[PDB]
Amino acid sequence: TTGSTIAEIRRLRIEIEKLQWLHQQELSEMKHNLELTMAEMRQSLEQERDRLIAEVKKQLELEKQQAVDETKKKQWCANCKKEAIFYCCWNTSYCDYPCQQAHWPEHMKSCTQ
């Protein structure tokens, strides 16, 4: 029947028309939410970078102070900068006799005792 086919076609066409109007609000709010999550991620990553750098600097500054202080407690070879075991005169110590011999031409200029 002609009228019944026309009504069925018309019904389908109307359903397609309703399909067109769908999902506009979702996509248009999706871009704006993308901007906000992107900005929040950039800010959080920047704060985490600053926190990590500050922490690494604090820890290595403490490690440096510990190394310097440990170093002040010992005597160091004036020729090779390894730990020394005997001394010639003020602020001139050596780890073995060959370092003393090697360093003598320079140390001779300013030696005592």
Binding residues for Zn(2+): 77, 80, 88-89, 95, 99, 107, 111
**Which are the contacts of 77, defined by CB distance < 8 A and separation ≥ 6?**
83, 84, 93, 94, 95, 99
Q: In angstroms, give the least distance from the CB of 101 to Zn ion.
A: 10
Residue 52 or 104: which CB sits closer to a second copy? 52
Binding piece for Zn ion, criterion CB under 5 A, among 15-23, 34-42, 46-54, 71-79:
71-79
Distance of CA 24 to CAs 16, 17, 31, 37, 96, Å? 15, 14, 12, 20, 85
Is residue 78 within the footprint of Zn ion (CB under 5 A)? Answer: no
Say if CB 95 and CB 73 are below 8 A apart: no
Residue with structure tokens 């359903």?
A: 15
Interface with Zn ion, residue 88, by CB under 5 A: yes
Helices (H), the chain: 2-21, 24-72, 97-107
Instruction: Name the site residues for a second copy (rule: CB under 8 A).
Output: 4-6, 8-10, 12-13, 15-16, 19-20, 23, 27, 30-31, 34, 37-38, 41-42, 45-46, 48-49, 52-53, 56-57, 60-61, 63-64, 67-69, 71-76, 81, 86-87, 90-91
